[model samples]
Target: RFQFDATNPDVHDPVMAREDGKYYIFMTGQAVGSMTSDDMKSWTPGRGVMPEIPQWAMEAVPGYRGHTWAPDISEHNGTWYMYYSCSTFGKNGSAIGLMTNKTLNPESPDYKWEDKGMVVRSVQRQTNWNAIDPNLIMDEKGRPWLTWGSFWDGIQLVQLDKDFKTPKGEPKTIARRYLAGANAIEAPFIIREGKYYYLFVSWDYCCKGANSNYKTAVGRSKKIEGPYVDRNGKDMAAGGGEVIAQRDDNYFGIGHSSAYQFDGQWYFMAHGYARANNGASKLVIRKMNFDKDGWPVLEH
Candidate 1:
């Protein structure tokens, strides 16, 4: 039900959360914030959740220069947890952080927020990629898992403790190389269906409007640690993935999507650079429908 819009500015990576009967939007960008909607079609943006720049983040970007990128919010056992990547946009050694709230209705009188603090930080230049763009999921065994990566290294993941804050054990690499077409590889999202786990990732640079060379690629796994295989059974490290989204003039780089199941259908929410003056890209809502083999297909 979304048409092109030029004035709404551009929203960054977004995820939808449903509580009681309402929906909330959490995302990353220049200034981190939240939005509330009865129906996603209409939204009212609110103040940044932890508005005051944190002291440590200030150290990273000198008064919080780069912040609030790729935030994923989820509910487990009625507790709301948000995982985000924070740091200077182009700076290295930043971190993937974790924050939580007891309720999703933070605007309510009884709602309050709690910061669980940093979960992953850059160790050195060689080992891990920029710890930005994160998505959270639960494996078949019900353990919390995080999928994330940036320009360097590639897509990475690690299990979260039972509390969903600390790492369950250690970190692991899933997608290491990329197919040659899109510019760079980043923003990995993983979802579980009946028998296999699908890992989706964006390839190439974003925020280029119609000129952007971005698309989405995918690999699948059965164990979740992923010796992920592509459509041709080629190793993902050798640069392989079945294409899901493509570059078009109406929108550029329509990747970075989070998948969820509501009622009985699956849906994904993401931002795309729309054709405006600067042709700023905003959010687009697309329904995710699976094929006969349980592979996801994004519609309109």
Candidate 2:
């Protein structure tokens, strides 16, 4: 039974996928959080993907503890690939690690997440970018590309090798919060619709409870390795992203979103701080529609 009007589930940095007639969400938490739903509306918590933090992640990132940060989930060639972040808050000494599983169903005999090791790492002073919030996208030609970053130099994109477990080239800057104030852009998610590739990013501060100003912004480009531009034709690399969603009176703020297509419908998912709950983060899913100009418009 689908609880169409059920209360929203708690989530943070959520990335979603559907498999075996179930909707699954993977997010930030201890060993990477997992949740499942028969219908898209109601969700129930499941087991974490990893029982413990990887040995290499703990050794590579100082003060990382055991909790994982933003995670991105995708399926390629019948295997599920999960990329997660390990880092301390406000630090660039971060690394994005990868894992693979044959099934998301816990009851299945093949349900096992195998750590493939670190995909990329960023040292505190040696690198200007934070290696977190990884999102993978497949181009028209079926080449995999990883896009991620935070705080320091903005969002970055790097081509992945044929194995999809390692980078093949240098990372390139694709977007930034290029304003005079704080560069608060992160969480890059790219999805192709029609003829363009849209880049979505979170802007402003998050995890500040009711005071959080997190919002979602976006830009689009024709090519996979892009010069994405906003509706006003401002380049995203120059800090030009059109605000798509933001805080409302009911919710404190919303950001760190992921978009997907299932059953011929587009859905946008993110975490919003509930004002009634003193800003507890909760999952928010909205039906997505595109305007005549190919810009995404979330349903109210």
Candidate 3:
């Protein structure tokens, strides 16, 4: 089982990865605060991933003065790739950047993340969707696709160039939630389960902690480019998703999740506001299972 200290730095928009039985987690903040755990309970904090905010991000996304938000890490061949977002809240000015490392394990013979510069970005008025909250997926054919968006048209996906460093096609709209003409869905995390491509997204307000109504929902499709539908067969583009996680008395405003498989069991890694802790955003992990209908279910 896992345990932790209350004094540990508050981690929001977290993503977790494991290697050689050691766990590494990264979250949104200035320069990105990261940690490693040999056992889930005890964590050792590491240095920020960057010395300062990338210059390209600063120039591309106006109002993006500091802090790196939401990161996803994965390995391809022998190299480790990390995708991160830089932006100001409620603003469309944003950029998605990449960093590559030989290894995330500090104990390893070599470890360092080399900034790969800007991958893609949104210029307010130019791109319909904000270019924040990035997640990467290697499709069944081994092609790389990047999905990200927040509060605009909806979740956006684009095909990546062979180098896996740049976008090469028109962005596709995958999901959205509408309320009086504003969208609330964001933080797109896609994973493949059997023949279906699962699209996970966070819905509702975040950042307000206890007052935040953030919740997790998901939909799936057989094809990568989807007409993804919820368990009720409602189209995601039309505001449809199966609720996978939501607020309980113990916590509130939970969302911005990533799915991971460990030892054959599935879990959703996310952040939430603790009811007893002044609505502070903190890391959370919940077991994820598929119902007999093949829909995702979150178990506390």
Candidate 4:
């Protein structure tokens, strides 16, 4: 199967959704861009939601300071929330921001980029380490929580302050303390089942094409602020993790997947580098089914 490879995409951060039994995926635009899909295959990107740089945001970082990173999407209160890392990717001096819209129809006349303003910015305030990779986690009581973090320390989480616009209380330090393999671990997608809250992360370095060791690893905690341990009962901050998935000859560097369900089945979608003649990275959507023990089984 061939993956979706946009032209010089600069496309790493992804947010995918299944609405009305159809798939829609969006990603970083260098500033504010996206790509959409149906049936989990093929894609078309729109010219970013924010056509003009919003007035509130000023270029705060060097290199590339105006774009977004690690975009995340989730539905709440009948509305869709597009949470994104409003940082120059790898700039470290970045912020986590969000945008909300009523419809997924990118071409809808009412489909306008409604910027919700800055959720969190850590650029000049690098000492705070409170920006990047904003993922929405809906708790049992219908309140939303956000998990984020990168080079500063490790993956961290915080509850949304009532309105889901700012930090609920304070940022909670959880998940990988540093890069899983000393290569900058980012993009955390946390999910909750009955009693366990599983924190999933993209381990190792990404964007390396065929030489990438990108894979999925996880840690479980009965409570959200965890002593998060790996499969070997070892601490994650101490360089421990439960290996989930990795690269193969066919599709190398398969990592950073988000989980979703359709009908009676579950599936995972992630970008991978399909073995091309010269080899380049592309997005691949694959079905994910769980085992009786409550683990995931992915299609090869």
lDDT on C-alpha atoms for all candidate structures: 0.72, 0.89, 0.85, 0.67
Descending-TM-score candidate ranking: 2, 3, 1, 4
The candidate that wins on lDDT is: 2
| Tens digit per residue, CA lDDT, model 1, 29-119 | 5446677777667777766766454556556434356458878888888778877777665555677777777887766775766677677
Model 4 spans > 4 angstroms off: 1-11, 62-66, 128-130, 177-183, 277-279
| Top TM-score prediction, candidate number | 2
Residue 192, model 1: Cα distance from true site in angstroms? 1.4
Q: What are the clashing pairs of model 4? A: 161-168, 267-288
Better of 2 and 3 by TM-score: 2
TM-scores, in order shown? 0.88, 0.96, 0.94, 0.86
Candidate 3, residues 1-300: lDDT per residue as tens digits?
765563444688999888888988988867877887886656777888775677887888776766889988888888888899988877778889998888888767788778889988887666789888999898888999999999889999899996878899789999988521378999999999977999999999898867988998999999988798998899998899987778887678889999999899998888888888788887788788887888888776
Between 1 and 2, whose TM-score is larger?
Answer: 2
Question: How big is the positional error of residue 18 in model 3, measured in Å on the Cα after superposition?
Answer: 0.9
Per residue, candidate 2 scores C-alpha lDDT tens digits across 132-172 of 99999999999999999988888999999978878997899
Q: Write the per-residue lDDT of candidate 4 for residues 20-112, one digit (tens) a residue.
A: 766677776655567755555556766665556555556544444457666888888767887776555445666677778887776677666
